[PDB]
């Protein structure tokens, strides 16, 4: 393709041009990766490394084409592209470094979005059971509240995935609501005097409380990873947001570097 006879100017201008393209591509994949899109991690890594390869050619030369370091005329343009690139790269490395956390958290949320509605369904079965078999009104009302509390646990999940200002308290809410839910479940199964929950004894209801309790194993099992690692989700969302802003200024400094090169290639 290119070699030692290849024109030096077109190399400076093409590399600088391609940094414009690569800055958009780093920004698009940084934001999609922060949103859990697993494929975007590879594309982010590749565009980040493409940029680094081209930037190093502009700074130190390309040995394989005997392209020298860039002229000192464009040194001020280079110097300012370098500050933005340093920022772009550090943030994108922060995102790439959290790939497993981000993808594991989204896996947990994906299955939670299936099992929690199933909890809701079986508790409203339990509501119908206790109601229509004349079971005591206090068991009915607890089951009704258990149903709505499962919905509130689910609602905390997306708020965690946002990775915004509120996501870490959404994750505290998830865990507290899940604690109350598990305690009220055991209280319906075994009785709980401290909280005034009567042991349910309708056998059909008891059947569906045991299925509920088995589904709930995954919700309660997910509480630790949500608490521990949801701050990561905020960090990578912040890094992607930084990426976008540095991306836009780098787009402009890169167009000026390209313009400086094209000027030298015409005397100006």
From Swiss-Prot:
General function of this protein: May be a part of a signal-transduction system that regulates twitching motility by controlling pilus function (extension and retraction).
Subcellular location: Cell inner membrane
Periplasmic membrane side: 1-268
Organism, as annotated: Pseudomonas aeruginosa (strain ATCC 15692 / DSM 22644 / CIP 104116 / JCM 14847 / LMG 12228 / 1C / PRS 101 / PAO1)
Disulfide bonds: none
Coiled-coil residue spans: none
Family from the record: Belongs to the methyl-accepting chemotaxis (MCP) protein family.
Stated name of the protein: Protein PilJ
Portion of the parent chain present: 39 to 306 of 682
